[PDB]
């Protein structure tokens, strides 16, 4: 027995928490990403990068704490602890935004580790690797939003900050600056997410209301046996119901469960593509035909033009505080405002 | 409004007047819908991962299931054996009824709250 | 020289036809506004 | 409205070419029996 094979043996022992070779990458990176977020949201400010308080220590609550992005002046610096910006000073590293890159990069390698773990366990147990494949969607979203998007922009400053409210701000930024709701790739993402939740609900309800009476109890959970070969619910009755209610129904259980994989995974992949475009400000911002008409015809009004006015409000009213490095000074008289408000 | 851009207009105005993003019932809606999409993919991928070999590489695996057959078409014990090791044993369902009830309840309850 | 043994027939069932047409038509319905712009 | 005139042929081929592909495959499936 060679040393490599003995380490393999140990890594792959059946224990309460399986380790694997993938564990060597996953477990440190996941725990560090998670610990960095808890550490930063509990103790670390965003005063010097953002002009914001962002920790429990400072008075924030669970909704407003964040690990915020580094200052725009850092560009796309890796912001290594030992790098030229922090120069090994942990305190300054925290104050400059180093925990952001720390979490994002450890988080990325942790995500790789997790998908490798899905591959590793699937190979050991003898199943097909479709759960790993499905997980590619969360990966694509993470890299496109947290990494590719800021890399096309001026700096990590414009990536999402890791916090509840900070992400809310990210949503609103994308509306006002990118008109992201108008983007067909986001729309396909919305359909895959909302379609997935629909499939989840309708499949679970269907199964639960087409059960075979396999026991005498009023609690029907007891009448299932994980080793029984029989289907626990009637595909035939399910199919009849939905055919008569909705017009069409599933008839093939394999297609049904593949479709459940397909819909949300595809939707997430589509949204990631749109965000790659927004990395370059390659937006679906306008319809040219609408703008030509509206410039010429002051009586022409649509929900599209109404929403651009809202975007314009968002940009002028949030930019000075949201982008402090720009030193925007907008006197009262230049702020867009409707009547009275 | 009954329209695509009208919908977005309604959402934006709602946020300005109600700060819906900072409202817990909408946060629960997101958890219901993100979680619903998550569990949709999870369940679809776990059942898909454990289909029993009934076909050749030259045909769609879907032809391994015939409408109204009495036998289950996947091995739920293998699915559980994979998912319980991916996390740990007791975070994985071995009871298909509880599993499908959970699938039903999570997004329904989340969407009740957001409504 | 013998005929090529690797040839296989290809299939698309009616349900796949309906699913694929719906996908294409809905995609067209979605993107056409952006093509006309 | 001043739309891109090429949007018509773009849309027409976007519908036509994939649809025809599927019809071709379906009809030759049926005639196999």
């Amino acid at each position: 027995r060679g040393w490599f094979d003995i380490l393999d043996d140990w890594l792959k022992r059946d224990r309460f928490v399986f380790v694997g070779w993938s564990g060597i990458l996953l477990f440190p990176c996941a725990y560090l990403a998670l610990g960095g977020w808890l550490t930063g949201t509990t103790f670390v400010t965003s005063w010097y990068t953002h002009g914001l308080a962002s920790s429990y220590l400072e008075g924030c609550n669970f909704l407003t704490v964040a690990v915020s992005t580094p200052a725009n002046s850092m560009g796309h610096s890796l912001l290594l602890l030992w790098g030229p910006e922090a120069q090994g000073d942990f305190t300054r590293w925290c104050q400059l935004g180093g925990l952001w890159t720390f979490i994002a990069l450890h988080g990325a390698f942790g995500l790789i580790g997790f998908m490798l773990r899905q591959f590793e366990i699937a190979r050991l147990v003898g199943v097909r690797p479709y759960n790993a494949i499905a997980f590619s969607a969360p990966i694509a979203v993470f890299v496109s939003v947290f990494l590719i998007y800021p890399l096309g922009q001026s700096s990590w400053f414009f990536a999402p900050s890791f916090g509840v409210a900070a992400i809310f701000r990210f949503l609103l930024f994308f509306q006002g600056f990118h008109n992201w709701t108008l983007n067909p790739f986001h729309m396909m993402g919305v359909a895959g997410v909302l379609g997935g939740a629909l499939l989840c609900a309708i499949h679970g309800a269907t199964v639960e209301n087409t059960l075979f009476q396999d026991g005498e109890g009023a609690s029907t959970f007891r009448a299932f046996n994980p080793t029984q070969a029989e289907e626990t619910y009637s595909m035939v009755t399910a199919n009849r119901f939905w055919s008569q209610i909705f017009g069409i129904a599933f008839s093939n259980k394999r297609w049904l469960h593949f479709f459940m994989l397909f819909v949300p995974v595809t939707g997430l992949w589509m949204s990631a593509i749109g965000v790659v475009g927004l990395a370059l400000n390659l937006r679906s911002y306008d319809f040219i035909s609408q703008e030509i008409r509206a410039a010429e015809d002051p009586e022409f009004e649509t929900f599209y033009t109404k929403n651009l006015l809202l975007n314009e409000g968002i940009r002028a009213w949030m930019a000075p505080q949201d982008q402090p490095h720009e030193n925007f000074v907008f006197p009262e008289e230049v702020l867009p405002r409707g009547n009275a408000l | 409004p009954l329209g695509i851009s009208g919908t977005f207009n309604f959402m934006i105005v709602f946020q300005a007047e109600h700060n819906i993003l900072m409202h817990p019932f909408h946060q629960l809606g997101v958890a219901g819908v993100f979680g619903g999409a998550l569990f949709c993919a999870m369940h679809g991928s776990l059942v898909t991962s454990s289909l029993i070999r009934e076909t050749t590489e030259t045909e769609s695996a879907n032809y391994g299931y015939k409408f109204g057959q009495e036998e289950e078409t996947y091995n739920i014990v293998a699915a559980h054996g994979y998912f319980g090791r991916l996390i740990f044993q007791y975070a994985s369902f071995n009871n298909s009824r509880s599993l499908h009830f959970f699938l039903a309840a999570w997004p329904v309850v989340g969407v009740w709250f957001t409504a | 020289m013998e005929p090529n043994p690797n040839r296989q027939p290809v299939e698309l069932n009616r349900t796949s036809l309906y699913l694929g047409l719906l996908l294409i038509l809905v995609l067209a319905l979605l993107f056409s506004s952006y093509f006309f712009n | 409205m001043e739309v891109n005139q090429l949007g018509l042929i773009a849309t027409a081929l976007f519908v036509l070419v994939p649809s025809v592909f599927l019809i071709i495959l379906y009809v030759q499936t049926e005639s196999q029996q």
Binding site: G247, I248 | G68, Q69 | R14, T15, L22, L25, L29 | L8
Partner: peptide, 30 residues
């Protein structure tokens, strides 16, 4: 021309619904 195109595609989808429901491949047991 753009209006015609939008309504044409919409109409094709409605027609597809008809065929998919009434001219579906019939599900057959075992």
């Amino acid at each position: 021309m753009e209006t015609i195109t939008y309504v044409f595609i919409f109409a094709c989808i409605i027609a597809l619904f008809f065929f998919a429901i009434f001219f579906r491949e019939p599900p057959r047991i075992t």
